[PDB]
Amino acid sequence: NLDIIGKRIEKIKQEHETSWHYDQDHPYKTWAYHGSYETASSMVNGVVRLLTKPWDIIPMVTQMAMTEKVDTRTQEPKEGTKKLMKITAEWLWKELGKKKTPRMCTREEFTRKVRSNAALGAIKWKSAREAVEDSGFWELVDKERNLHLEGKCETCVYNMMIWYMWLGARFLEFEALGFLNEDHWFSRENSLSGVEGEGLHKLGYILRDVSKKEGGAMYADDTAGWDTRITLEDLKNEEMVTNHMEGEHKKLAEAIFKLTYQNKVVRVQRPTTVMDIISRRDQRGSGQVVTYGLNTFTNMEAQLIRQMEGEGVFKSIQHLTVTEEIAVKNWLVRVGRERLSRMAISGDDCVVKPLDDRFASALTALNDMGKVRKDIQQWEPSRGWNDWTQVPFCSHHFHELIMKDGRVLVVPCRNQDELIGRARISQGAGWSLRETACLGKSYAQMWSLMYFHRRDLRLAANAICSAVPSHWVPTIHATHEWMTTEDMLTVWNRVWIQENPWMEDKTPVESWEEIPYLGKREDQWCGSLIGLTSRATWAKNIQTAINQVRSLIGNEEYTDYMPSMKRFRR
Numbered sequence: 001n002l003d004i005i006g007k008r009i010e011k012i013k014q015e016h017e018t019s020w021h022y023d024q025d026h027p028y029k030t031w032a033y034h035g036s037y038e039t040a041s042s043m044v045n046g047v048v049r050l051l052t053k054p055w056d057i058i059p060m061v062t063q064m065a066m067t068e069k070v071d072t073r074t075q076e077p078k079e080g081t082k083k084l085m086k087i088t089a090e091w092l093w094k095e096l097g098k099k100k101t102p103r104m105c106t107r108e109e110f111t112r113k114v115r116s117n118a119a120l121g122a123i124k125w126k127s128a129r130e131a132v133e134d135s136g137f138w139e140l141v142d143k144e145r146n147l148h149l150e151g152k153c154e155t156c157v158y159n160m161m162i163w164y165m166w167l168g169a170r171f172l173e174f175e176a177l178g179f180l181n182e183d184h185w186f187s188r189e190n191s192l193s194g195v196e197g198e199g200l201h202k203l204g205y206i207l208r209d210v211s212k213k214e215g216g217a218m219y220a221d222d223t224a225g226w227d228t229r230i231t232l233e234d235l236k237n238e239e240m241v242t243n244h245m246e247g248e249h250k251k252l253a254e255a256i257f258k259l260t261y262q263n264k265v266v267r268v269q270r271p272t273t274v275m276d277i278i279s280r281r282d283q284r285g286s287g288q289v290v291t292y293g294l295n296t297f298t299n300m301e302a303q304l305i306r307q308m309e310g311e312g313v314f315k316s317i318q319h320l321t322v323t324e325e326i327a328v329k330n331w332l333v334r335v336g337r338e339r340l341s342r343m344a345i346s347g348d349d350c351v352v353k354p355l356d357d358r359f360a361s362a363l364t365a366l367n368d369m370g371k372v373r374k375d376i377q378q379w380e381p382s383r384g385w386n387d388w389t390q391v392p393f394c395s396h397h398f399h400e401l402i403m404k405d406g407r408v409l410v411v412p413c414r415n416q417d418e419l420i421g422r423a424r425i426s427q428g429a430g431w432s433l434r435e436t437a438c439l440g441k442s443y444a445q446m447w448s449l450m451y452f453h454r455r456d457l458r459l460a461a462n463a464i465c466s467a468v469p470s471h472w473v474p475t476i477h478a479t480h481e482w483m484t485t486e487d488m489l490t491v492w493n494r495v496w497i498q499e500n501p502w503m504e505d506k507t508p509v510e511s512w513e514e515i516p517y518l519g520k521r522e523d524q525w526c527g528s529l530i531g532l533t534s535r536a537t538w539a540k541n542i543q544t545a546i547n548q549v550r551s552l553i554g555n556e557e558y559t560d561y562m563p564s565m566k567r568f569r570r
């Protein structure tokens with residue numbers, strides 16, 4: 001308690017000593033309140049919207065651009081649950097460690113990241129790019145760092161909104177734990193369940209490979225507030241990664257887990273406006289990228305245990321017998337790798353193809369670990385999927401699509417209203433017409449690469465790339481091959497043919513017309529506006545929309561991509 005968070009509390013209390021009140025009308029029950037002191041909406045991308053006019057009248061698209069569970073308490077698991085988690089976690093860190101070496105990340109790696117611009121989620125210095133160059137920052141980092149070796153913390157404080165800390169705390173986190181992401185610990189090759197750095201063009205092939213295994217249905221249960229259900233027991237099993245570490249690193253990592261993860265401190269703005277200095281031990285509070293890795297780890301653990309319960313490796317979560325402990329360990333050593341290979345896990349998101357459908361009603365460990373399923377009753381058995389093409393994963397489903405030459409594409413898909421609505425939204429303001437156009441172009445090239453099989457998206461993508469100057473540059477499961485000025489057909493051939501391990505025949509495709517679409521009926525099912533008069537007017541009069549946007553941007557060098565499509569080929 002206060003002996004670990006006090007210093008951080010004391011430092012803040014003094015920076016606002018003038019205005020400090022211990023409010024008695026504070027809304028926190030499960031969060032500890034210490035005191036109080038006085039104290040970037042969604043915009044529309046006009047380039048994308050002018051080139052998607054039929055969607056101006058679709059409420060699912062237009063509503064997307066308009067516009068308390070953290071204060072809950074998860075009970076401590078039973079002793080038999082806690083045992084199962086401890087044994088599985090120890091075995092899983094060993095497996096992940098077999099072919100990887102934990103190691104500290106470096107400023108010269110962190111710096112380069114800030115130069116490339118990433119969601120480091122950091123709050124004297126204007127931007128992050130500036131602070132990185134000023135050694136005064138690195139001096140502050142040194143003081144804190146040397147404090148962490150002391151077993152103490154001063155400035156590592158969360159700001160609720162998404163939990164931003166200041167760039168310095170983010171570095172000390174990245175220094176100790178960045179290896180997890182930087183060195184691909186949750187790669188499919190390394191972790192067997194993971195998909196880190198796979199890409200949306202590989203996920204469908206991965207789910208089809210799981211489907212090939214003998215077993216029951218495919219289960220894809222979402223957790224209700226995954227992060228809020230992260231117990232102190234989960235934070236302590238995650239910390240066992242430090243047992244694979246040495247020297248300074250082991251100390252630095254131990255400090256992040258002890259002082260920032262297992263004993264947090266947060267400043268939340270309450271408009272009644274008084275900045276509450278609230279604390280708590282449990283729930284998920286980290287950088288988005290370390291959160292991804294530890295979420296994947298803990299999810300892999302929970303799902304192996306749910307598989308154990310379904311296969312009758314253990315009878316009761318209340319207590320584990322000495323013989324059961326040996327049986328769990330023997331199960332992991334004998335079949336652990338096989339059972340990891342039956343799953344696709346991305347943070348809190350999973351798909352499991354268990355040995356059989358006993359898994360569907362194996363609920364006691366899952367519920368007692370506090371990973372309560374969403375959109376169902378706690379003890380109602382899971383609904384599985386019989387077809388890998390119906391399974392939801394990372395907000396997508398996957399279609400099997402046969403090319404006119406017999407080669408097989410497995411393509412990602414979601415409701416087209418969600419795709420068009422997202423492309424019409426920008427995260428921030430103050431951007432130029434040029435920067436808005438380059439973001440439109442990023443969406444267009446993503447659509448050409450991932451969603452080429454949707455008739456409306458291939459047409460709108462061609463229209464946007466025709467409307468934006470040819471040479472202008474586009475601006476954690478994913479890898480982003482669409483962020484380039486290279487020709488999109490060349491990138492398509494690299495991604496879907498050359499580099500695709502599921503494609504035996506490497507014959508390049510010579511034109512976009514060789515590249516197939518979904519069934520005309522399969523397109524409407526996933527939200528296409530084909531067979532509507534509106535969409536017909538838009539398609540026919542596409543060159544007029546392209547010319548409207550060219551006139552707004554001005555006299556630049558443009559390319560006509562519309563003749564890459566059959567209907568505009570004269």
Ligand SMILES: Cc1cc(Cn2nc(C)ccc2=O)on1
Pocket residue numbers: 425426427428431435436439475
């Ligand atoms: C993805 C993503 C990035 C942004 C923020 N943004 N918005 C504009 C208008 C221009 C550039 C830019 O980066 O919005 N969505």
Ligand SMILES: Cc1cc(Cn2nc(C)ccc2=O)on1
Pocket residue numbers: 455520521524530531532
């Ligand atoms: C079902 C179904 C059949 C069609 C006919 N049609 N097909 C296309 C590809 C474009 C426009 C068009 O009217 O559209 N939806």
Ligand SMILES: [Cl-]
Pocket residue numbers: 384385386387390
């Ligand atoms: Cl199904």
Ligand SMILES: [Cl-]
Pocket residue numbers: 442443446
């Ligand atoms: Cl994007």
Ligand SMILES: [Zn+2]
Pocket residue numbers: 144148152153154155156259
């Ligand atoms: Zn600290």
Ligand SMILES: [Zn+2]
Pocket residue numbers: 397399413414526
């Ligand atoms: Zn679909």
